[PDB]
Structure formats: C-alpha cells, structure tokens
Coordinates of C-alpha atoms and ligand atoms in Angstrom, one line a residue:
Chain A
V10 CA -15.4 5.5 -8.1
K11 CA -12.3 3.6 -7.0
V12 CA -12.4 2.0 -3.5
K13 CA -9.1 0.9 -2.4
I14 CA -8.8 -2.4 -0.7
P15 CA -5.9 -2.2 1.8
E16 CA -2.9 -4.0 0.5
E17 CA -2.7 -6.1 3.7
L18 CA -6.2 -7.5 3.2
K19 CA -5.7 -8.8 -0.4
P20 CA -4.0 -12.0 0.7
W21 CA -7.0 -12.7 2.9
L22 CA -9.3 -12.2 -0.1
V23 CA -7.2 -14.7 -1.9
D24 CA -7.5 -17.1 1.1
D25 CA -11.3 -16.6 1.2
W26 CA -11.5 -17.4 -2.5
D27 CA -9.3 -20.5 -1.9
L28 CA -11.5 -21.7 1.0
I29 CA -14.8 -21.2 -0.7
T30 CA -13.9 -22.0 -4.3
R31 CA -11.1 -24.6 -4.1
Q32 CA -11.4 -26.3 -0.7
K33 CA -15.2 -26.2 -0.8
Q34 CA -15.5 -24.8 2.7
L35 CA -18.2 -22.6 4.2
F36 CA -18.1 -19.7 6.6
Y37 CA -19.7 -20.5 10.0
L38 CA -23.3 -19.1 10.0
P39 CA -24.8 -17.5 11.9
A40 CA -21.6 -15.4 12.2
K41 CA -20.1 -15.4 15.7
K42 CA -18.8 -11.9 15.0
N43 CA -21.5 -10.4 12.7
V44 CA -21.3 -7.3 10.6
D45 CA -23.5 -5.4 13.1
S46 CA -20.9 -6.1 15.9
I47 CA -18.0 -4.9 13.6
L48 CA -19.8 -1.7 12.7
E49 CA -20.7 -1.1 16.3
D50 CA -17.0 -1.6 17.2
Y51 CA -15.9 0.8 14.5
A52 CA -18.4 3.4 15.6
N53 CA -17.2 3.1 19.2
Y54 CA -13.5 3.3 18.0
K55 CA -14.3 6.6 16.3
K56 CA -16.0 8.2 19.3
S57 CA -13.2 7.3 21.7
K64 CA -18.4 13.9 13.8
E65 CA -20.5 11.3 15.7
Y66 CA -23.6 11.8 13.5
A67 CA -21.3 11.4 10.5
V68 CA -19.8 8.1 11.7
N69 CA -23.3 6.8 12.5
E70 CA -24.4 7.7 9.0
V71 CA -21.5 5.8 7.4
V72 CA -22.3 2.8 9.6
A73 CA -26.0 2.9 8.6
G74 CA -25.1 3.3 4.9
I75 CA -22.7 0.4 5.0
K76 CA -25.4 -1.7 6.7
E77 CA -28.0 -0.8 4.1
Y78 CA -25.7 -1.5 1.2
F79 CA -24.6 -4.8 2.7
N80 CA -28.2 -5.9 3.4
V81 CA -29.1 -5.2 -0.2
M82 CA -25.9 -6.6 -1.8
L83 CA -25.1 -9.7 0.2
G84 CA -27.7 -12.0 -1.5
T85 CA -27.2 -10.4 -4.9
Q86 CA -23.5 -9.8 -5.6
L87 CA -21.4 -10.8 -2.5
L88 CA -21.7 -14.6 -2.7
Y89 CA -19.7 -17.2 -4.6
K90 CA -21.9 -19.7 -6.4
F91 CA -20.8 -22.5 -4.0
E92 CA -22.3 -20.4 -1.2
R93 CA -25.8 -20.0 -2.7
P94 CA -27.4 -23.1 -1.0
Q95 CA -26.1 -22.2 2.4
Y96 CA -27.6 -18.7 1.9
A97 CA -30.9 -20.2 0.9
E98 CA -30.7 -22.4 4.0
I99 CA -30.1 -19.3 6.2
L100 CA -33.2 -17.5 4.7
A101 CA -35.2 -20.6 5.4
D102 CA -33.9 -21.0 9.0
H103 CA -34.0 -17.4 10.1
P104 CA -36.4 -15.3 8.1
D105 CA -36.7 -11.5 8.7
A106 CA -33.1 -11.6 10.0
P107 CA -31.1 -9.0 8.1
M108 CA -27.9 -10.1 6.5
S109 CA -25.8 -7.7 8.6
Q110 CA -26.8 -9.9 11.5
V111 CA -26.2 -13.2 9.9
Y112 CA -22.9 -12.7 8.0
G113 CA -19.5 -11.7 9.2
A114 CA -16.2 -10.1 8.3
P115 CA -15.2 -11.9 5.0
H116 CA -18.4 -10.9 3.3
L117 CA -18.4 -7.4 4.6
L118 CA -14.9 -7.1 3.1
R119 CA -16.2 -8.5 -0.2
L120 CA -18.7 -5.7 -0.1
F121 CA -16.0 -3.1 -0.8
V122 CA -14.7 -5.0 -3.8
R123 CA -18.0 -4.1 -5.5
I124 CA -19.5 -1.0 -3.8
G125 CA -17.4 1.5 -5.8
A126 CA -19.4 0.7 -8.9
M127 CA -22.6 1.6 -7.0
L128 CA -21.2 4.8 -5.5
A129 CA -21.0 6.4 -8.9
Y130 CA -24.8 6.6 -8.9
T131 CA -25.3 8.2 -5.5
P132 CA -26.9 11.7 -5.5
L133 CA -23.8 13.3 -3.9
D134 CA -21.6 16.1 -5.2
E135 CA -17.8 16.0 -5.4
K136 CA -17.0 17.2 -1.9
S137 CA -19.5 14.9 -0.3
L138 CA -18.4 11.9 -2.4
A139 CA -14.8 12.6 -1.3
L140 CA -15.9 12.7 2.3
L141 CA -17.7 9.4 1.9
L142 CA -14.6 7.8 0.3
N143 CA -12.6 9.2 3.2
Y144 CA -14.9 7.5 5.7
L145 CA -15.0 4.3 3.7
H146 CA -11.2 4.1 3.5
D147 CA -11.0 4.8 7.2
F148 CA -13.3 1.9 7.9
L149 CA -11.3 -0.3 5.6
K150 CA -8.0 0.5 7.4
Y151 CA -9.9 -0.2 10.7
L152 CA -10.6 -3.6 9.2
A153 CA -7.0 -4.0 8.3
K154 CA -5.8 -3.0 11.8
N155 CA -8.0 -5.7 13.4
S156 CA -7.4 -8.3 10.6
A157 CA -5.9 -10.8 13.0
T158 CA -9.2 -11.2 14.9
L159 CA -11.6 -10.5 12.1
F160 CA -10.3 -12.6 9.2
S161 CA -9.3 -16.2 9.9
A162 CA -9.6 -19.6 8.3
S163 CA -10.7 -21.0 11.7
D164 CA -14.2 -19.5 10.9
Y165 CA -14.5 -21.8 7.9
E166 CA -15.5 -25.5 8.0
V167 CA -15.5 -28.3 5.4
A168 CA -19.0 -28.4 3.8
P169 CA -20.6 -31.8 4.6
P170 CA -21.3 -34.3 1.7
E171 CA -25.0 -33.4 2.2
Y172 CA -24.2 -29.9 0.9
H173 CA -22.8 -31.0 -2.4
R174 CA -25.9 -33.0 -3.5
Chain B
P4 CA -29.9 14.1 1.5
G5 CA -27.5 12.0 3.6
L6 CA -23.8 11.2 4.0
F7 CA -24.2 7.7 2.6
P8 CA -27.4 7.8 0.5
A9 CA -28.5 4.9 -1.6
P10 CA -27.9 5.0 -5.4
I11 CA -30.7 6.5 -7.5
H12 CA -32.1 5.6 -11.0
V13 CA -29.9 3.0 -12.5
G14 CA -27.9 2.5 -9.4
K15 CA -30.8 0.8 -7.6
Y16 CA -31.2 -1.7 -10.5
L17 CA -27.5 -2.4 -10.5
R18 CA -27.3 -2.8 -6.8
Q19 CA -30.2 -5.3 -6.8
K20 CA -28.7 -7.2 -9.8
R21 CA -27.8 -10.8 -9.2
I22 CA -24.2 -11.4 -10.1
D23 CA -22.0 -14.3 -8.9
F24 CA -19.1 -12.9 -6.9
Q25 CA -15.8 -12.8 -8.8
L26 CA -12.5 -11.9 -7.3
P27 CA -10.7 -9.3 -9.6
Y28 CA -7.6 -10.5 -11.3
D29 CA -5.5 -7.7 -9.9
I30 CA -6.0 -9.6 -6.6
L31 CA -6.5 -13.2 -7.8
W32 CA -3.2 -13.3 -9.7
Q33 CA -1.6 -13.7 -6.3
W34 CA -3.1 -17.1 -6.0
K35 CA -1.6 -18.4 -9.2
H36 CA 1.7 -16.9 -8.2
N37 CA 1.5 -18.6 -4.8
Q38 CA 0.9 -21.9 -6.6
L39 CA 3.8 -21.4 -9.0
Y40 CA 6.2 -20.1 -6.4
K41 CA 5.6 -19.8 -2.7
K42 CA 3.5 -17.2 -0.9
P43 CA 6.1 -14.5 -0.2
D44 CA 7.2 -14.1 3.4
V45 CA 7.0 -10.7 5.1
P46 CA 10.3 -9.0 4.0
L47 CA 12.4 -8.6 7.2
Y48 CA 15.3 -6.2 7.7
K49 CA 16.6 -3.8 10.4
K50 CA 14.7 -0.6 10.0
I51 CA 17.0 2.4 10.6
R52 CA 16.5 6.1 10.4
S53 CA 20.1 7.1 9.5
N54 CA 22.9 5.5 7.5
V55 CA 25.2 3.0 9.4
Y56 CA 28.9 3.4 8.7
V57 CA 30.8 0.1 8.7
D58 CA 34.4 0.5 7.4
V59 CA 34.1 3.9 5.6
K60 CA 32.7 7.3 6.4
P61 CA 31.4 9.1 3.3
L62 CA 32.8 12.6 4.0
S63 CA 32.3 15.2 1.3
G64 CA 34.9 17.7 2.5
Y65 CA 32.5 20.6 2.0
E66 CA 31.3 23.0 4.8
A67 CA 28.1 24.6 3.7
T68 CA 28.5 28.3 4.2
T69 CA 25.8 31.0 3.7
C70 CA 24.2 31.8 0.4
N71 CA 22.7 35.1 -0.7
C72 CA 19.1 33.7 -0.5
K73 CA 16.5 36.2 0.5
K74 CA 14.4 35.4 3.7
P75 CA 10.8 35.9 2.7
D76 CA 9.0 38.4 4.9
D77 CA 5.8 36.4 4.5
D78 CA 6.3 33.3 6.7
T79 CA 4.0 31.4 4.5
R80 CA 6.4 30.8 1.6
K81 CA 9.6 28.8 1.9
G82 CA 13.0 30.5 1.7
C83 CA 15.6 28.6 -0.3
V84 CA 13.8 27.8 -3.6
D85 CA 15.3 26.8 -7.0
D86 CA 17.8 29.7 -7.2
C87 CA 19.7 28.8 -4.0
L88 CA 23.5 28.6 -4.6
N89 CA 23.9 25.8 -2.1
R90 CA 21.0 23.9 -3.7
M91 CA 22.7 24.5 -7.0
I92 CA 26.0 22.9 -5.9
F93 CA 23.9 20.0 -4.4
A94 CA 24.7 21.0 -0.8
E95 CA 22.0 21.4 1.8
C96 CA 22.1 24.6 3.8
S97 CA 23.5 24.6 7.3
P98 CA 21.0 25.7 10.0
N99 CA 23.8 27.8 11.7
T100 CA 24.6 29.8 8.5
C101 CA 21.4 30.0 6.4
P102 CA 19.9 33.5 6.1
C103 CA 16.4 32.0 5.8
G104 CA 16.5 30.3 9.2
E105 CA 13.7 27.8 9.8
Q106 CA 12.0 28.9 6.6
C107 CA 14.7 27.3 4.5
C108 CA 13.5 24.4 2.3
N109 CA 17.1 23.3 1.4
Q110 CA 17.4 21.1 4.5
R111 CA 15.0 18.4 3.4
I112 CA 17.3 15.4 4.0
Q113 CA 18.7 16.5 7.3
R114 CA 15.2 17.4 8.6
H115 CA 14.0 13.9 7.4
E116 CA 11.2 15.5 5.5
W117 CA 10.3 12.1 4.0
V118 CA 7.1 11.8 2.0
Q119 CA 4.8 10.0 4.4
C120 CA 2.3 8.5 1.9
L121 CA 4.4 5.5 0.6
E122 CA 3.1 2.0 0.7
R123 CA 4.7 -1.4 -0.1
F124 CA 2.7 -3.5 -2.5
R125 CA 3.0 -6.7 -4.6
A126 CA 4.0 -6.2 -8.3
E127 CA 3.2 -9.1 -10.6
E128 CA 6.6 -10.0 -12.0
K129 CA 8.7 -7.6 -9.9
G130 CA 8.1 -8.8 -6.4
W131 CA 7.8 -6.1 -3.8
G132 CA 7.4 -2.5 -5.0
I133 CA 6.7 1.0 -3.5
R134 CA 3.8 3.1 -4.6
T135 CA 2.7 6.6 -3.5
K136 CA -0.8 6.9 -1.9
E137 CA -1.0 10.7 -2.8
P138 CA 0.1 12.6 -5.8
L139 CA 3.7 13.9 -6.1
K140 CA 5.1 16.8 -8.1
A141 CA 8.3 16.8 -10.0
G142 CA 11.4 17.6 -8.0
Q143 CA 9.8 16.6 -4.8
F144 CA 12.0 15.0 -2.2
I145 CA 10.4 11.6 -1.5
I146 CA 12.7 9.6 0.8
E147 CA 16.3 9.0 1.7
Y148 CA 18.0 5.8 0.7
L149 CA 19.3 4.3 3.9
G150 CA 21.6 1.3 4.7
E151 CA 25.1 0.3 5.7
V152 CA 27.9 2.4 4.1
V153 CA 30.6 -0.1 3.2
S154 CA 33.6 -0.3 1.0
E155 CA 33.7 -2.3 -2.2
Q156 CA 36.0 -4.7 -0.4
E157 CA 33.5 -5.2 2.4
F158 CA 30.6 -5.5 0.0
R159 CA 32.5 -8.2 -2.0
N160 CA 33.2 -10.0 1.2
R161 CA 29.5 -9.9 2.1
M162 CA 28.5 -11.1 -1.3
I163 CA 31.0 -14.0 -1.1
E164 CA 29.9 -15.1 2.4
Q165 CA 26.2 -14.4 2.9
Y166 CA 24.6 -13.0 -0.3
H167 CA 25.0 -16.2 -2.2
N168 CA 21.5 -17.5 -1.4
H169 CA 19.9 -14.2 -2.5
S170 CA 17.8 -13.5 -5.6
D171 CA 17.8 -9.7 -5.2
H172 CA 20.0 -7.4 -5.2
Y173 CA 19.8 -4.2 -2.4
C174 CA 22.6 -1.7 -2.9
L175 CA 23.2 1.8 -4.3
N176 CA 26.5 3.1 -5.5
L177 CA 27.5 6.0 -3.3
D178 CA 30.9 6.2 -4.9
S179 CA 33.2 4.2 -7.1
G180 CA 34.5 2.5 -4.0
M181 CA 31.7 3.0 -1.5
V182 CA 28.3 1.3 -1.5
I183 CA 25.1 1.8 0.5
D184 CA 24.1 -1.8 1.2
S185 CA 20.5 -2.3 2.3
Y186 CA 20.4 -6.1 2.3
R187 CA 20.2 -6.2 6.1
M188 CA 19.6 -2.7 7.3
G189 CA 17.8 0.2 5.6
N190 CA 14.3 1.7 5.0
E191 CA 11.4 1.3 2.6
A192 CA 13.6 2.7 -0.3
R193 CA 15.1 -0.8 -0.6
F194 CA 11.8 -2.0 -2.2
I195 CA 11.8 0.5 -5.1
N196 CA 12.0 -1.2 -8.4
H197 CA 14.0 -0.5 -11.6
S198 CA 12.6 1.1 -14.7
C199 CA 14.0 2.0 -18.1
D200 CA 11.6 5.0 -18.1
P201 CA 11.9 6.1 -14.4
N202 CA 9.7 8.6 -12.6
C203 CA 12.2 9.2 -9.8
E204 CA 16.0 9.6 -9.6
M205 CA 18.7 9.3 -6.9
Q206 CA 20.7 12.4 -6.1
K207 CA 23.9 12.6 -4.0
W208 CA 23.8 15.6 -1.6
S209 CA 26.5 16.9 0.7
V210 CA 24.6 17.2 4.0
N211 CA 26.6 18.8 6.9
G212 CA 29.8 17.2 5.7
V213 CA 28.7 13.7 4.7
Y214 CA 27.3 12.3 1.4
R215 CA 23.7 11.2 1.5
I216 CA 21.5 9.8 -1.3
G217 CA 17.9 11.0 -1.7
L218 CA 15.1 9.9 -4.1
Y219 CA 13.5 12.8 -5.9
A220 CA 10.5 12.8 -8.3
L221 CA 11.5 13.1 -11.9
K222 CA 7.9 14.0 -13.0
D223 CA 4.4 14.4 -11.7
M224 CA 2.7 11.2 -10.5
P225 CA -0.9 10.6 -9.5
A226 CA -2.0 8.5 -6.5
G227 CA -1.3 4.8 -6.8
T228 CA 1.8 5.3 -9.0
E229 CA 4.7 2.9 -8.4
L230 CA 8.0 4.6 -7.7
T231 CA 10.8 3.6 -10.1
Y232 CA 14.4 4.7 -10.9
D233 CA 17.2 3.7 -13.2
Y234 CA 19.4 1.2 -11.4
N235 CA 22.2 1.9 -14.0
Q244 CA 21.7 -10.8 -14.7
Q245 CA 18.0 -10.0 -14.4
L246 CA 15.3 -10.0 -17.1
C247 CA 13.6 -6.5 -17.0
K248 CA 9.8 -6.5 -16.6
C249 CA 9.4 -2.7 -16.5
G250 CA 7.0 -2.8 -19.5
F251 CA 8.0 0.2 -21.5
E252 CA 8.4 0.8 -25.2
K253 CA 12.2 0.8 -25.9
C254 CA 12.9 -1.3 -22.7
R255 CA 16.6 -2.2 -22.4
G256 CA 15.5 -5.9 -21.9
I257 CA 17.9 -6.4 -19.0
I258 CA 18.3 -4.4 -15.7
Ligands
SAM301 C1 16.2 -3.4 -4.6 S1 15.2 -4.9 -5.0 C2 13.6 -4.1 -5.2 C3 12.5 -4.8 -4.4 C4 12.1 -6.2 -4.9 N1 11.1 -6.1 -5.9 C5 11.7 -7.1 -3.7 O1 10.8 -8.0 -3.8 O2 12.3 -7.0 -2.6 C6 15.7 -5.2 -6.7 C7 15.2 -6.5 -7.2 O3 13.9 -6.5 -7.6 C8 13.7 -7.0 -8.9 N2 13.3 -6.0 -9.8 C9 13.5 -4.6 -9.6 N3 13.1 -4.0 -10.7 C10 12.7 -4.9 -11.7 C11 12.2 -4.8 -12.9 N4 12.0 -3.6 -13.5 N5 11.9 -5.9 -13.7 C12 12.1 -7.2 -13.1 N6 12.5 -7.3 -11.8 C13 12.9 -6.2 -11.1 C14 15.0 -7.7 -9.3 O4 14.9 -9.0 -9.0 C15 16.0 -7.0 -8.4 O5 17.0 -7.9 -8.1
ZN302 ZN1 19.8 29.7 0.0
ZN303 ZN1 18.9 27.8 3.2
ZN304 ZN1 12.8 -2.2 -18.6

C-alpha cells in the first residue's frame, strides 16, 4: 500500500532529518500543538460522513500511539522519549508529540495497511481519507511544521 | 469491522516492531543535492491562461467550417470522435458551425479542458518536472503550452539581453520564425522535461483562426508518471536504453 507524502511536505521531512540527525536538536516536548489537537482541528475542518472522519481520526490516533515509540523515532531521540515516559506515565503519545512525528507516521503506515482486514473498496476509501488528511497537513504546513519548535539538545543529553 | 481497523496476524507484530526511523532515499536525496548545490527556490513566473502575443500573431488562415460528424442521440457519448474531418486536419471545430453542438469533443483547447491532476515535483538530475496524479489514456489532451508568442528576432534579443544568466531553457517552436517563450510567462507546461522515449507529444492545432500548441498523451500512463516529450548543450538524464546522450 503506497501512501503518498505531499510533495510540499518532503522538504520539511528533510529539514526534520537535518535538525534531529545533523544539528542534534530535539522537538519541544510536551508538544505545544499535540497530535490530538491536530486531529481535532482536521475533524472540525471536515464537518464545517461525520462518523467516517471520526473513525479515521481514531485510527490515526491508535496507529500513532502504537508506532511512535517503535518506528517513528530517530536514534538520537530515544533518550528524550524515555525521559518523557518517566516524567508523564500513562500519557498517550498522541498527547505528548506533535506535527513532525505524526507526519513521520505516514512514511511507514502504508506497510502496515497491507495487513488490515479490509477489502479493496474500503482500503481505497481509507487511502482517500488518509491522503485528504495529508493534504490538510500540507495546507497548514506554515503553522504546523517549523524549526522554531526545535531546540539544541543540552550537553547533559549527549552523555 | 471498522473504517480504520488495526492490522491482524503479522501486521500487529510488524507494527510493534522496534525499528530506528530512516528517511527514505527518494526523499533524503534532496538533502545531499541541497548540500552540493543550493536548495532550489520556488520557481516564479507570471501564470497566464492564454498566450500573450508580443510582436507576432500566429494566424493559421483557416476558418473551421462544419464537418459531416453525426450528433449522437444519446447525450452521454461525445460527438466528434476520431473520424472527425476537422480533427483529421488538426483544426478544432467551431461552436457556431459544429453539428454536434455542446456534445462535440473537438474543442478541447478552446474550452480549456486541461487535465486537472498534474503536480510539479523534484526530479533527481532534471530539476523540476511534472507528474500526473491520476492515470491517463493515449491521445488524451493534457494541457496547453502557454507563453509569449514572439518572433525569432525578439527571442534572440531576449536571449542576448536577459537570458544570459539562465541554466534552462523555456521555449517551444511554434513555427520556423515564431516561438512560444515561457521564460517569464506561461503555465505548468513549462516544467515538463525532455525524453528520448517520450510518453507525450506537442501538436499544433488551428483553433478559431490562431495556432495553439497542446500536449497530448502518446501512450497510457499510470498515476505518478512523469510527463515527458521530445524537445527536438545539455547532458540528457532521461535514463532510457538507446538514449541520444544529449538533449
Ligand atoms: C523547459 S525546462 C523543464 C523544467 C526544468 N526541469 C526546471 O527545473 O525548471 C528544460 C530544462 O530542464 C532540464 N531538463 C529537461 N529534460 C532533461 C533531461 N531529460 N535530462 C537532463 N535535464 C533535463 C534542462 O536543463 C533543460 O534546460
Ligand atoms: Zn466533427
Ligand atoms: Zn465538432
Ligand atoms: Zn535521453
């Protein structure tokens, strides 16, 4: 299953990779604009088919809350993540993390979607809703994705 | 069930598998390119919906008169298909003379029936390119090539005076003495790359007395396919067995 990352958002994925991997920066946690807020904003943008949009939002939340700590983190981010778990247990990841990591989710979710118990028509509907949400992210890219949400990791972090 | 159910059997295991995040190379290549050369600016130009005539007017001298095309009684099917005589002399029908009326599909350029699923993307060694987000069938009218219609004298003047700091080159030959120059003004067609094995082609049509160029699909293309045509000194990176080496 091929999920299509909007062409406008790929330079931001490059920037995210640069900030985390080269410049050794970290996204501000807890996120000031968390994944829950973004999903709520999208659900409200759609209702301005309601049960369908809410199902997509719930599914994105579930997949993110399973995948954030497993597949959505650069290695340099692992300590911070552990820190978060220590500081705010029982807080779901959709409440702690923000837009860059939710975007990272769609780079890897397509591999998982091939094992969902849906037929061809429903899988096409799901891909439709997912690409709709992705272009919603692309429309609001100016407010959602920004290097100003990243900060230099302190020397304490590097050990 | 559900609209977005979780993955079953081996999908649960793969979803819960710990794997350090890796940016795919079809995105990460941009970073190395931005380090070797600069991050490309947003390509700016004056977007126009119709050609702009500078010092020439590309008149064709042909008034499109009626054909013998049959107007389908079923309003579902289009009128002027492959056997239209106007279409066969590469002239679009006129709305005042066509027997098929508003069912005629030989007015695609003048009705601006552009394909609306094109997208500008970054191609590794070719810069900006145009891809189609939906599938296209052969012979489909895709888009019109727009720009400033200039004489070869005007184009040479422009190349002497302001296209000396340019590494691309944005023009179609409308004639042996007229050119459609899309350096400054045009549409998305100015981003379509060259190929030695093209999937599209440019066709010159007589549309209500003036010549206009349109890009038509040479063969079927699935979604995500980059549009190319044969431009007719740059190293060619089209990547095709029996490539001419140079554009
Ligand atoms: C009309 S522009 C096409 C859009 C261009 N890629 C851009 O970034 O704006 C033509 C230019 O694109 C580049 N180009 C087009 N086709 C190419 C190809 N097949 N291989 C290498 N470069 C190509 C050449 O530099 C050429 O001067
Ligand atoms: Zn006809
Ligand atoms: Zn007709
Ligand atoms: Zn070639």
